Design a protein around this ligand. Structure first.
Ligand code: NA
Ligand SMILES: [Zn+2]
Ligand SMILES: [Zn+2]
Ligand SMILES: [Zn+2]
Ligand SMILES: [Zn+2]
Ligand SMILES: [Zn+2]
Length: 80
């Protein structure tokens, strides 16, 4: 009914994968621009969202997961 638990858990994956200070992670955080995600970091992060949330993110959708919000919205829609 609100996105708070899934936002918490998305930020958990972002923090585990990228190692950045949790305080820096917000819905508008862009993985490449803000958190210095390189191409390898990005593939692994996508795969972690897939494993952690039991969702599928094919390469055509993966390219569009730019931000924390994108990932949250995608997962929410996948589970709907
Ligand atoms: Na494809
Ligand atoms: Zn947590
Ligand atoms: Zn963890
Ligand atoms: Zn991999
Ligand atoms: Zn977006
Ligand atoms: Zn939502």
């Amino acid at each position: 009914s609100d996105d708070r638990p899934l936002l918490e858990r998305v930020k958990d994956v972002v923090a585990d994968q990228l190692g950045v200070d949790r305080a820096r992670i917000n819905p508008e955080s862009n993985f490449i621009k803000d958190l210095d995600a390189d191409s390898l970091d990005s593939v692994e992060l996508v795969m972690a969202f897939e494993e952690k949330f039991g969702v599928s993110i094919p390469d055509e959708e993966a390219s569009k997961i730019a931000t924390v919000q994108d990932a949250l919205s995608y997962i929410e829609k996948a589970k709907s």
